[PDB]
Design an enzyme around this catalytic site. Structure first.
Site, PDB file in Angstrom:
ATOM      1  N   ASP A  77      42.807  30.721  36.228  1.00 19.50           N
ATOM      2  CA  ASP A  77      43.586  31.314  35.141  1.00 19.50           C
ATOM      3  C   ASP A  77      45.083  31.417  35.478  1.00 19.50           C
ATOM      4  OD1 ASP A  77      43.664  33.428  36.937  1.00 19.50           O
ATOM      5  OD2 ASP A  77      42.640  34.882  35.644  1.00 19.50           O
ATOM      6  N   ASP A 128      44.931  35.318  44.423  1.00 23.25           N
ATOM      7  CA  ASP A 128      44.355  36.401  45.214  1.00 23.25           C
ATOM      8  C   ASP A 128      45.067  36.511  46.545  1.00 23.25           C
ATOM      9  OD1 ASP A 128      42.500  36.846  43.203  1.00 23.25           O
ATOM     10  OD2 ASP A 128      40.917  35.747  44.235  1.00 23.25           O
ATOM     11  N   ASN A 139      43.638  30.989  41.493  1.00 25.02           N
ATOM     12  CA  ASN A 139      42.534  31.020  40.541  1.00 25.02           C
ATOM     13  C   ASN A 139      42.818  30.098  39.365  1.00 25.02           C
ATOM     14  OD1 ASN A 139      42.728  34.500  41.135  1.00 25.02           O
ATOM     15  ND2 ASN A 139      41.246  33.106  42.081  1.00 25.02           N
ATOM     16  N   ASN A 159      43.788  40.406  43.220  1.00 26.71           N
ATOM     17  CA  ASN A 159      44.151  39.425  42.216  1.00 26.71           C
ATOM     18  C   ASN A 159      45.329  39.810  41.314  1.00 26.71           C
ATOM     19  OD1 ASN A 159      43.602  38.404  39.230  1.00 26.71           O
ATOM     20  ND2 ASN A 159      42.942  36.846  40.685  1.00 26.71           N
ATOM     21  N   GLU A 173      35.937  37.305  51.966  1.00 31.75           N
ATOM     22  CA  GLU A 173      37.101  37.101  51.107  1.00 31.75           C
ATOM     23  C   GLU A 173      38.234  36.374  51.838  1.00 31.75           C
ATOM     24  OE1 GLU A 173      37.451  37.412  48.019  1.00 31.75           O
ATOM     25  OE2 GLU A 173      35.781  38.679  47.340  1.00 31.75           O
ATOM     26  N   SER A 215      46.352  33.019  38.100  1.00 27.82           N
ATOM     27  CA  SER A 215      46.546  34.124  39.020  1.00 27.82           C
ATOM     28  C   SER A 215      46.288  33.662  40.452  1.00 27.82           C
ATOM     29  CB  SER A 215      45.626  35.288  38.653  1.00 27.82           C
ATOM     30  OG  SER A 215      44.262  34.941  38.832  1.00 27.82           O
TER      31      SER A 215
HETATM   32  C1  LIG Z   1      36.781  32.275  39.487  1.00 28.44           C
HETATM   33  C2  LIG Z   1      36.603  33.610  40.147  1.00 28.44           C
HETATM   34  O1  LIG Z   1      35.592  34.285  39.986  1.00 28.44           O
HETATM   35  N1  LIG Z   1      37.613  34.019  40.924  1.00 28.44           N
HETATM   36  C3  LIG Z   1      37.602  35.292  41.629  1.00 28.44           C
HETATM   37  C4  LIG Z   1      38.585  36.264  40.994  1.00 28.44           C
HETATM   38  O2  LIG Z   1      38.208  36.470  39.638  1.00 28.44           O
HETATM   39  C5  LIG Z   1      38.598  37.587  41.755  1.00 28.44           C
HETATM   40  O3  LIG Z   1      39.689  38.581  41.613  1.00 28.44           O
HETATM   41  C6  LIG Z   1      39.023  39.315  40.639  1.00 28.44           C
HETATM   42  O4  LIG Z   1      39.304  38.810  39.378  1.00 28.44           O
HETATM   43  C7  LIG Z   1      38.443  39.399  38.399  1.00 28.44           C
HETATM   44  C8  LIG Z   1      38.618  38.615  37.116  1.00 28.44           C
HETATM   45  O5  LIG Z   1      39.943  38.701  36.612  1.00 28.44           O
HETATM   46  C9  LIG Z   1      38.754  40.891  38.262  1.00 28.44           C
HETATM   47  O6  LIG Z   1      37.769  41.430  37.470  1.00 28.44           O
HETATM   48  C10 LIG Z   1      38.182  42.120  36.336  1.00 28.44           C
HETATM   49  O7  LIG Z   1      38.736  43.368  36.734  1.00 28.44           O
HETATM   50  C11 LIG Z   1      39.202  44.154  35.631  1.00 28.44           C
HETATM   51  C12 LIG Z   1      39.944  45.334  36.212  1.00 28.44           C
HETATM   52  O8  LIG Z   1      39.081  46.185  36.954  1.00 28.44           O
HETATM   53  C13 LIG Z   1      38.008  44.542  34.770  1.00 28.44           C
HETATM   54  O9  LIG Z   1      38.372  45.367  33.737  1.00 28.44           O
HETATM   55  C14 LIG Z   1      37.805  46.636  33.758  1.00 28.44           C
HETATM   56  O10 LIG Z   1      36.483  46.573  33.245  1.00 28.44           O
HETATM   57  C15 LIG Z   1      35.807  47.836  33.293  1.00 28.44           C
HETATM   58  C16 LIG Z   1      34.368  47.582  32.911  1.00 28.44           C
HETATM   59  O11 LIG Z   1      34.278  46.975  31.631  1.00 28.44           O
HETATM   60  C17 LIG Z   1      36.517  48.810  32.364  1.00 28.44           C
HETATM   61  O12 LIG Z   1      35.850  50.067  32.403  1.00 28.44           O
HETATM   62  C18 LIG Z   1      37.965  48.963  32.808  1.00 28.44           C
HETATM   63  O13 LIG Z   1      38.675  49.786  31.889  1.00 28.44           O
HETATM   64  C19 LIG Z   1      38.647  47.597  32.907  1.00 28.44           C
HETATM   65  N2  LIG Z   1      39.985  47.737  33.463  1.00 28.44           N
HETATM   66  C20 LIG Z   1      41.094  47.367  32.815  1.00 28.44           C
HETATM   67  C21 LIG Z   1      42.384  47.590  33.542  1.00 28.44           C
HETATM   68  O14 LIG Z   1      41.057  46.877  31.691  1.00 28.44           O
HETATM   69  C22 LIG Z   1      37.323  43.278  34.268  1.00 28.44           C
HETATM   70  O15 LIG Z   1      36.134  43.611  33.560  1.00 28.44           O
HETATM   71  C23 LIG Z   1      36.965  42.356  35.433  1.00 28.44           C
HETATM   72  N3  LIG Z   1      36.437  41.095  34.937  1.00 28.44           N
HETATM   73  C24 LIG Z   1      35.357  40.506  35.456  1.00 28.44           C
HETATM   74  C25 LIG Z   1      34.946  39.207  34.827  1.00 28.44           C
HETATM   75  O16 LIG Z   1      34.738  41.000  36.394  1.00 28.44           O
HETATM   76  C26 LIG Z   1      38.676  41.591  39.618  1.00 28.44           C
HETATM   77  O17 LIG Z   1      39.259  42.892  39.550  1.00 28.44           O
HETATM   78  C27 LIG Z   1      39.410  40.796  40.696  1.00 28.44           C
HETATM   79  N4  LIG Z   1      39.126  41.344  42.010  1.00 28.44           N
HETATM   80  C28 LIG Z   1      40.086  41.723  42.860  1.00 28.44           C
HETATM   81  C29 LIG Z   1      39.622  42.222  44.186  1.00 28.44           C
HETATM   82  O18 LIG Z   1      41.279  41.674  42.565  1.00 28.44           O
HETATM   83  C30 LIG Z   1      38.784  37.361  43.259  1.00 28.44           C
HETATM   84  C31 LIG Z   1      38.555  38.617  44.071  1.00 28.44           C
HETATM   85  O19 LIG Z   1      39.006  38.469  45.409  1.00 28.44           O
HETATM   86  O20 LIG Z   1      37.850  36.385  43.751  1.00 28.44           O
HETATM   87  C32 LIG Z   1      37.929  35.120  43.098  1.00 28.44           C
HETATM   88  O21 LIG Z   1      37.043  34.212  43.666  1.00 28.44           O
END
Ligand SMILES: CC(=O)N[C@@H]1[C@@H](O)[C@H](O[C@@H]2O[C@H](CO)[C@@H](O[C@@H]3O[C@H](CO)[C@@H](O[C@@H]4O[C@H](CO)[C@@H](O)[C@H](O)[C@H]4NC(C)=O)[C@H](O)[C@H]3NC(C)=O)[C@H](O)[C@H]2NC(C)=O)[C@@H](CO)O[C@H]1O
Ligand SMILES: [Cl-]
Ligand SMILES: [Cl-]
Ligand SMILES: [Cl-]
Ligand SMILES: [Cl-]
Ligand code: NA
Length: 129
Positions: free
Chosen positions: A48, A52, A46, A59, A35, A50
């Site tokens: 969108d 990291d 990113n 993120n 990472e 945002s």
């Molecule tokens: C282009 C690319 O891939 N870039 C990467 C970044 O995306 C990534 O940082 C991560 O970003 C993703 C996408 O926004 C994020 O994932 C989302 O996280 C949320 C919160 O946990 C999820 O929502 C939850 O889903 C579960 C299961 O359905 C539910 O039970 C729960 O209630 C939900 N929570 C909420 C609050 O609603 C999303 O489902 C999920 N989306 C996807 C597509 O996975 C990650 O959390 C981000 N990660 C971090 C560490 O912040 C980045 C990471 O370093 O890396 C880029 O390359």
């Protein structure tokens, strides 16, 4: 700060990440390697709008506030700049919330693509711990 490998392992272990939510320490060290290359100051934009932040690339769409990710959440209740500190406390505390939110460590794309399923214990080889 650019952590050494065992230096980061020790810090993560002290802060309770070893086997947190069932993820062994090597998983966390591997995730940080790919990472951020162990660099606490790492930032990446990113598509969108945002960004990291920090050693675990947390993120701003979900987890921290950077003031320029409109419509985002701040679920760790922290300014994103706090995730760039040389002290990893804030990043670890926030990572604990992230990995608990349903998808485990799949929240870290580099972990899923480069660490998951691999010999992650090798990342703490040689470390005293
Ligand atoms: C282009 C690319 O891939 N870039 C990467 C970044 O995306 C990534 O940082 C991560 O970003 C993703 C996408 O926004 C994020 O994932 C989302 O996280 C949320 C919160 O946990 C999820 O929502 C939850 O889903 C579960 C299961 O359905 C539910 O039970 C729960 O209630 C939900 N929570 C909420 C609050 O609603 C999303 O489902 C999920 N989306 C996807 C597509 O996975 C990650 O959390 C981000 N990660 C971090 C560490 O912040 C980045 C990471 O370093 O890396 C880029 O390359
Ligand atoms: Cl290394
Ligand atoms: Cl914002
Ligand atoms: Cl990847
Ligand atoms: Cl391990
Ligand atoms: Na935010």
């Amino acid at each position: 700060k650019v952590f050494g490998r065992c230096e980061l392992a020790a810090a993560m272990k002290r802060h309770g990440l070893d086997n947190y939510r069932g993820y062994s320490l090597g998983n966390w060290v591997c995730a940080a390697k790919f990472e951020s290359n162990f660099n606490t100051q790492a930032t990446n934009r990113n598509t969108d709008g945002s960004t990291d932040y920090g050693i675990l690339q947390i993120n701003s769409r979900w987890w921290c506030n950077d003031g320029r990710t409109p419509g985002s959440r701040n679920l760790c209740n922290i300014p994103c700049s706090a995730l760039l500190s040389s002290d990893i406390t804030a990043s670890v505390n926030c990572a604990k919330k992230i990995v608990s939110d349903g998808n485990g460590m799949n929240a870290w794309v580099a972990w899923r693509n480069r660490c998951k399923g691999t010999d992650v214990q090798a990342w703490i080889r040689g470390c005293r711990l």
